[PDB]
């Protein structure tokens, strides 16, 4: 045709990563320039995003060991 919509959800507190589809969750990683070659199932993308959320969505830096 000439126009179609796309999703742009990156406010992680708004939507449960468990209830989303793997196609929808892949576009979060594509927006952050990331991939996961070892991901076999949807939950592997979820487990990634859950650690990438405080990396790319917080206003303050993260801290760990």
From Swiss-Prot:
Q: Give the GO biological process terms.
A: dopaminergic neuron differentiation; neuron projection development
Q: Which GO terms describe its molecular function?
A: growth factor activity
According to the record, which residues of the full protein are present here? 127 to 187 of 187
- According to UniProt, the name of this protein is Cerebral dopamine neurotrophic factor
Q: What induces it?
A: Not induced by endoplasmic reticulum stress.
Please tell me in which tissues this protein is expressed.
Widely expressed in neuronal and non-neuronal tissues. In the brain, highest levels in the optic nerve and corpus callosum.
Predominant location: secreted
KW RNA-binding (keyword) present:
no
Q: Mind telling me which GO cellular component terms the entry cites? A: endoplasmic reticulum; extracellular space
Localized where? Secreted
Q: What does this protein do?
A: Trophic factor for dopamine neurons. Prevents the 6-hydroxydopamine (6-OHDA)-induced degeneration of dopaminergic neurons. When administered after 6-OHDA-lesioning, restores the dopaminergic function and prevents the degeneration of dopaminergic neurons in substantia nigra.
Sorted keywords for this record are: Disulfide bond, Growth factor, Secreted, Signal
């Amino acid at each position: 045709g000439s126009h179609m919509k796309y999703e742009k959800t990156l406010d992680l507190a708004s939507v449960d990563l468990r209830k989303m589809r793997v196609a929808e969750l892949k576009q979060i990683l594509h927006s952050w320039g990331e991939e996961c070659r070892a991901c076999a199932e949807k939950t592997d993308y979820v487990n990634l995003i859950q650690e990438l959320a405080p990396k790319y969505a917080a206003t303050h830096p993260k801290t760990e060991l």
